[model samples]
Target: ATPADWRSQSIYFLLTDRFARTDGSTTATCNTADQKYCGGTWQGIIDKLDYIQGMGFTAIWITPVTAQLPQDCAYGDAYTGYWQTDIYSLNENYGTADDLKALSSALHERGMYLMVDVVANHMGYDGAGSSVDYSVFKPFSSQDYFHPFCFIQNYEDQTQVEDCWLGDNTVSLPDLDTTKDVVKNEWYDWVGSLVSNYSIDGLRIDTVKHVQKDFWPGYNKAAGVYCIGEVLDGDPAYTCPYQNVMDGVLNYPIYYPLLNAFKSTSGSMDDLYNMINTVKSDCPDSTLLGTFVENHDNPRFASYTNDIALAKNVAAFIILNDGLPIIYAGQEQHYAGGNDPANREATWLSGYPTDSELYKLIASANAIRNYAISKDTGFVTYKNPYIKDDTTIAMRKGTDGSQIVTILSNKGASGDSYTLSLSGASYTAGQQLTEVIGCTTVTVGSDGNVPVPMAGGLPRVLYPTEKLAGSKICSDSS
Candidate 1:
């Protein structure tokens, strides 16, 4: 298998402590009350690798693997791997160093890539008003490596956002003075070695907005792999700039609007399209951005909608659209926890059902995505289409004339049949069109339009009919 490329492959993001339990553990309990560790280990991930790869995801992005403080925060245990105490140490809670190495090797054997989450912005200090002992940390042992104790009061103030603490004093996470030359050199050196040591194919950098923009390019270059920063803002103005400094961003701008258009009733498809077009024009490289419908930071997609058809539609849109697709762990099982820990449900509770509706939809769409992109290496080259109505959004993607036409609807399970003219169909009137989702075949009309059925109001993936003659969109074998 070739090294994973972020632009082409799909990612399955899992929270380490909640994904799977250690094989022989009978004591570790997953109580969502405090959001603590449930004894999930690196071996546990290896055990369930098939569950992710079955969906056609070629990469797995796990939480930060660094050593964490043994103590609990105000909310819960630091089992999610976010509260880093030692940059050089691996948290025994996940596994030993040898276990991590085995994970990297196993993923490679399966032709899948590994993306380790990393926190460079701060070291963990419980909100308990107790100060950190700098000497205990490695490489960044001096007090000079951190910023002054100032809590972030105004998010609009760049100085405050970058220099101040993320949470309150109860959970005060000390900020790193990333602009300092010493901090820069230490980080670059640390991250470079971390990737090399872990055989890591990519990095999911934490708190990208908390650091100076100047710090990312060098940090990204130092790692010599794909890096998707967590620029937790919804505004394109704030999030797009990070793309210039890093390999890619988490596509937050799309996530918010998409939630509005699909999950909540706050926005329409027109608003979604407008947001998409604005971000396309604003971001440096939208095709390389990481596209996700569900993540650890927010409520599950099914939580708000409670409509499997809607989840399936959005699932299709994310996988088939331009950019890499990232599906959260329990999304396919329709986990409906609302915020933070609630959103991070244990995968075991759902029994890792591969037979779910959203699971089938994601697998089929990824099959189409993988097959289509192979024909044209630039399949992620996004081109906006003129949307015909407020309920629909369309796009043409791929390069070298190899493209996919997709139309997604927010009208949950509308049972109406409809026809819409597709703009920029590079096929003749007699060309056959196949809707990849339902595996329904149709001939392209003279006016280059497709007859789409609103059966369940699902999304459509239109392809050249002959291109997928015997292609099984959903299957057990790849």
Candidate 2:
């Protein structure tokens, strides 16, 4: 896929060691407490391509496959792959270098892209051991390649966040001196060669906020494809700046607001609408941003709201809204693991439920998205429309003269026989409309409104006749 292809591609994000295991081991046999490698490997991920591609995702973002230290963290093993031990070697715990090539080849064979997660901020920790033993990291293995030890005490200070070490005495993962010419040049060449060798279509750079701002452009340029950096902050001012430097950022600015507006009991849909407005107004590359509800780092969305309907609404919002949709592995199966190791549950445990309702909904949403993007490049330009309720959030999204309206209701599918105002766009008076998710029809009034019986607070993706799918039937039923 070309660079532009990234805009329309939906990403399925997974941790390499937690997603699948080629050995087909059971979670019962695996030690969950250690957060250790549960046997997931590149070959295992290759074995599960259909499970990922079947969800209609066009890209797969796996955690760092580079060599990780054979050590344990306070929580568990370094299986999540944030800490890097070697840039030149593949993590033997995952598979051979050949297995990594096969995984990339398999994705390409299926017309899907591979996005490799990378950590440039720091290397493996010595845990207060004798002088960090940097010699193990190869080429750049020396004290001069890293910054002098200084803890990150201030979150608001950019210098401290960029320059200071992330861990304390519990583990001392030394921060790389990104500002230094040698470190920057070595990283650029290392990443460039890594991308070239692995056929890496994109990159998900870790701890982007912790790296110098000027460090990325050269790094990203060397990789020569789309790159989404993890700023790991919720503020738009902090997160959006990376987009200016790199290809885009994992849209944390929208993530927190989405959780508040979708999962929090005190949150309102108006807050969500305003949040979308804030991102669109603030972030330059918002559409290219990596949009997700859950990942390896955070608590599950289901942890926040046990309500299935609320979960479904949250999924629909992430899928149908702007930016590249990124669904964590177990999100569709409603895996409810909360925080860290718990959140990083084994995908095999979910039994890879292929036909779940949430799975079908995501697939259907992807279908509509693909259909829309194919017809008009401007399909993602979701403009705000006049809405009538605090629980209702609708936007105009489509290309050409196509009118596709996405509506999400936090009231748990309760907006029955309710009139939703969706003005500010052209809609033929009394135009026949169909909701893509439910395959239900409604007619626009002479006043440019629709009677939105949301079918129990279910989010709606509506389109005028012949605009999407040609018929009102949902993908599964069809």
What residue pairs are clashing in model 2? 412-456, 412-457, 413-456, 413-457, 413-458, 414-457
Per-prediction backbone clash count: 4, 6
Model 2, 184-272: lDDT tens digits are 88878888777776688788788787787688888889878788887588777768756778886777877787787776554666666
**Per-residue lDDT of model 1, residues 276-376, tens digit only:** 77767577774667777877767787767667766776777776665678888887787887767676666766556677787777776777777766655
Candidate 2: count the clashes: 6
Q: Name the lDDT value of residue 389 in candidate 2.
A: 42
Listed in order, each prediction's TM-score against the native is 0.91, 0.92
- Model 2 residue 271 lDDT? 62
